[PDB]
Amino acid sequence: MRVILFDLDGTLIDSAKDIALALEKTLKELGLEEYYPDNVTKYIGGGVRALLEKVLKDKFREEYVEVFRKHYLENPVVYTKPYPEIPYTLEALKSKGFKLAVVSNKLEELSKKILDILNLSGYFDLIVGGDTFGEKKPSPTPVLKTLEILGEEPEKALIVGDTDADIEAGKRAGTKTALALWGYVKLNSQIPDFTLSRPSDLVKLMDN
Fold first, then answer.
1. Is-catalytic flag, 58?
2. Which of 22, 34, 89, 94 is exposed most, by the fewest CB atoms within 10 A?
3. Same-domain check for residues 121 and 179
């Protein structure tokens, strides 16, 4: 029928606290805690690499990314929970016959893990991740391959996320896009087709 592709962090799950903690740990071990930002939330956005990049700038080193994907995976879920209404919305969307999927830019082996721990895994007909198949958003292969492996044309899909990358992907891929206002909005210059202020509004949006 219709496909709804969701971003993971800042959309389905409120993972800010755990991320900040893993980052605090990594920096302490690496001897760089002085670069821990005053307001960390404006740094959490497109993966572990992009966060360390934004935090360290020229002090960035690739072997740091792996230090982070470590401290953060022995506490992938401590404070993290789905946003309010998300559990109801997935189950609701699934029972009305909608294919659901998580297209994120976070490790695909981990995308399946955090969701297993939060009992959300089962609602998704597929869980594409940061590495899954060859390219990360902004576009448009993760979304087109994810839609072929599902049997739906882009014209029947909806990307629900919070970044300029999500909007570009859907735009380039041919899907619809909606901003998850309840999540952590990181839009800069892009404009989505819709605005969802609450997850349940999704159930509404797909009514008629």
1. no
2. 34
3. yes
The DSSP code for 83 is: P
Q: How was this structure determined?
A: X-ray
Query: Would the annotation count 38 as a binding residue?
Result: yes
Q: Is 18 annotated as a binding residue?
A: no
Q: Is 79 annotated as a binding residue?
A: no
Instruction: Collapse the DSSP code of 181 into the 3-class scheme (helix H, G, I; strand E, B; otherwise coil) and give the result.
Output: coil
In which domain, by residue range, is 87 found?
Answer: 2-15+80-208
Q: Which of 61, 79, 97 is the last residue of a domain?
A: 79
Do 73 and 89 belong together in one domain? no
Token pair listed for 33: 């805690």
CATH number, domain containing residue 208:
3.40.50.1000
Q: What are phi and psi of 152, to 5 degrees?
A: -130, 145
Q: How far apart are the first and last CA of the chain?
A: 14
Give the CA diameter of the chain. 56
Resolution to one decimal, Å: 2.3
